Amino acid sequence: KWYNLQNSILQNENELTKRLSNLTIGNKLKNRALPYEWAKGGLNRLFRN
Amino acid sequence: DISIMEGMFAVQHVHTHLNHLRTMLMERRIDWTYMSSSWLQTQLQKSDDEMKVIKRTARSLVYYVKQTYNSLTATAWEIGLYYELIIPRHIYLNNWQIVNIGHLILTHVTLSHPYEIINRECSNTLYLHLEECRRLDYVICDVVKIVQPCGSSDCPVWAEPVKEPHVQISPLKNGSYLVLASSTDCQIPPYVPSVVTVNETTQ
Amino acid sequence: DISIMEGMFAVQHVHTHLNHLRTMLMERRIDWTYMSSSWLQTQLQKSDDEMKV
Amino acid sequence: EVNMTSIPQGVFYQPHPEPIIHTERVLGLSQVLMINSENVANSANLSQETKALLTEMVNEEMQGLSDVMIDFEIPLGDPRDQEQYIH
Amino acid sequence: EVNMTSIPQGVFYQPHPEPIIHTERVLGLSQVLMINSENVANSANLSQETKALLTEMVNEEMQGLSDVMIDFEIPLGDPRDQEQYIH
Ligand SMILES: *[C@@H]1O[C@H](CO)[C@@H](O[C@@H]2O[C@H](CO)[C@@H](O[C@@H]3O[C@H](CO)[C@@H](O)[C@H](O)[C@@H]3O)[C@H](O)[C@H]2NC(C)=O)[C@H](O)[C@H]1NC(C)=O
Ligand SMILES: *[C@@H]1O[C@H](CO)[C@@H](O)[C@H](O)[C@H]1NC(C)=O
Numbered sequence: 021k022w023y024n025l026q027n028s029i030l031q032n033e034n035e036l037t038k039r040l041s042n043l044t045i046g047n048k049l050k051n052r053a054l055p056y057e058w059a060k061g062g063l064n065r066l067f068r069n
Numbered sequence: 070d071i072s073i074m075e076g077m078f079a080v081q082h083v084h085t086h087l088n089h090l091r092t093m094l095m096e097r098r099i100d101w102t103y104m105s106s107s108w109l110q111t112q113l114q115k116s117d118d119e120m121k122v123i124k125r126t127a128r129s130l131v132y133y134v135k136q137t138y139n140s141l142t143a144t145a146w147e148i149g150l151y152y153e154l155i156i157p158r159h160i161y162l163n164n165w166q167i168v169n170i171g172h173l174i175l176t177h178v179t180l181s182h183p184y185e186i187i188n189r190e191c192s193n194t195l196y197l198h199l200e201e202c203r204r205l206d207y208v209i210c211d212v213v214k215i216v217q218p219c220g221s222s223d224c225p226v227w228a229e230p231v232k233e234p235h236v237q238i239s240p241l242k243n244g245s246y247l248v249l250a251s252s253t254d255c256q257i258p259p260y261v262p263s264v265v266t267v268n269e270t271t272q
Numbered sequence: 273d274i275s276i277m278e279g280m281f282a283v284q285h286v287h288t289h290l291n292h293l294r295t296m297l298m299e300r301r302i303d304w305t306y307m308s309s310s311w312l313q314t315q316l317q318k319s320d321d322e323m324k325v
Numbered sequence: 326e327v328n329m330t331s332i333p334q335g336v337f338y339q340p341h342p343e344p345i346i347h348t349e350r351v352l353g354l355s356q357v358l359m360i361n362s363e364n365v366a367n368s369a370n371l372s373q374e375t376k377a378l379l380t381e382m383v384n385e386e387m388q389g390l391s392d393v394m395i396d397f398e399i400p401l402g403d404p405r406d407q408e409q410y411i412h
Numbered sequence: 413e414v415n416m417t418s419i420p421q422g423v424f425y426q427p428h429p430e431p432i433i434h435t436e437r438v439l440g441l442s443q444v445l446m447i448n449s450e451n452v453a454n455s456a457n458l459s460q461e462t463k464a465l466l467t468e469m470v471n472e473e474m475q476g477l478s479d480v481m482i483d484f485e486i487p488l489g490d491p492r493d494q495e496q497y498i499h
């Protein structure tokens with residue numbers, strides 16, 4: 021839901037960069053950034069259902 | 070049908086304003102109807118009249134125009150604006166320019182004045198010398214200086230030899246003429262500049 | 273309703289011309305649709321083509 | 326006939342009615358406009374058929390504006406830095 | 413292939429289609445516009461409810477114009493005179 025039309029392009033880019041930098045080890049994403057079906061410890065932090 | 074034609078008027082009303090905004094943007098100006106401009110009056114404390122000058126002399130630049138939503142009954146666009154604001158320090162709303170004619174006695178004698186503008190907005194007259202001014206809307210100048218009225222001030226005198234007849238006539242922008250003539254074919258005193266107004270066309 | 277919507281067209285027509293006048297005035301030009309300009313052609317005698325300039 | 330007045334010292338004064346600003350400094354800013362038709366549709370009472378008549382006008386006007394703009398980027402930092410360019 | 417023509421004395425002529433005016437003098441004038449809505453209302457047949465729809469548009473347009481004008485006075489006389497300033 022953090023990606024929406026109400027924000028500008030630069031705002032969305034900053035959001036995506038910060039979220040990717042927070043939730044990545046090397047080039048692999050955390051389980052918490054995935055939905056509950058994609059990973060056991062998913063919290064839908066990055067993707068949705 | 071009436072239900073449709075009632076909503077069509079709002080579409081036309083929006084179309085007019087959107088066209089005006091497009092014209093202003095193509096013209097490197099700012100449409101202040103689409104922008105708030107109320108937040109920057111408090112951040113920098115200026116009078117109501119001083120904000121009008123800031124609004125009037127603003128230049129804009131568009132660096133991206135994009136579309137984000139492309140539904141059949143819904144759309145969304147974005148425009149990136151970069152604009153520059155000019156902050157003033159004085160206004161000088163009442164001005165008079167100085168024209169130097171001099172007198173001839175041939176030898177043409179003209180007094181030299183450092184100042185070029187006279188300001189009568191205040192109770193006392195101010196004498197202003199302007200440098201590197203720009204003529205865009207209101208006159209924009211980087212430096213203006215207050216100087217003394219050729220008193221506490223010194224003014225050089227330059228005299229140049231000139232051959233006869235040496236007549237000079239200058240339009241006065243209100244219909245009169247400024248005449249400086251050594252000879253006198255018309256009923257005009259010689260060697261003294263004069264202001265001439267005529268009821269009909271004469272030579 | 274038709275009585276109202278008939279008069280709304282005149283309002284729109286006036287709005288268009290008023291917006292054009294505002295643009296011209298902000299642009300340091302003269303909108304000659306709002307000004308006569310016929311009195312000064314006789315005071316100073318000029319041709320029709322010289323008045324356009 | 327003629328009308329006369331003798332200038333005393335050969336100095337005359339012109340009206341010159343334009344103001345003189347005497348600028349102090351120049352500032353630069355950035356802003357986004359965010360044109361959206363849903364707000365206008367909700368404020369009015371469009372009925373799913375005049376909405377398509379509004380999006381068409383908005384689209385054609387915005388395309389006409391976009392046909393003459395080059396879509397570049399505003400420099401903001403330092404030319405030497407490599408991290409911004411890499412990003 | 414190529415096409416050729418030898419210029420005789422090295423002088424060529426450019427179209428240059430803009431006119432050349434050669435001004436004589438410049439004049440200045442003043443005038444007042446006097447925008448009024450009663451004349452437009454009387455010319456049309458507004459019915460006491462579309463009149464309010466016209467005054468609203470006139471007011472908003474005139475306010476938009478007035479938001480960027482400084483409201484100064486035009487100099488017309490002589491800087492020395494005290495009576496005009498006192499008045
Ligand atoms: C165009 O502008 C010039 C500059 O103001 C006008 O010249 C000035 O006109 C005034 C008005 O008549 C003159 O004042 C008069 O002076 C006499 C003294 O000779 C005095 O007795 C009168 O009561 C009156 O105050 C003024 O002398 C004259 N010259 C200046 C100021 O240097 C000119 O008349 C204007 N032309 C038109 C067509 O309006
Ligand atoms: C010129 O002088 C005559 C009288 O000599 C006077 O009647 C006329 O009004 C004057 N014209 C001006 C001041 O424009």
Ligand SMILES: *[C@@H]1O[C@H](CO)[C@@H](O)[C@H](O)[C@H]1NC(C)=O
Pocket residue numbers: 414415
């Ligand atoms: C150039 O010359 C050729 C023949 O030499 C001719 O057919 C052609 O029309 C010419 N091109 C021009 C005049 O533009």
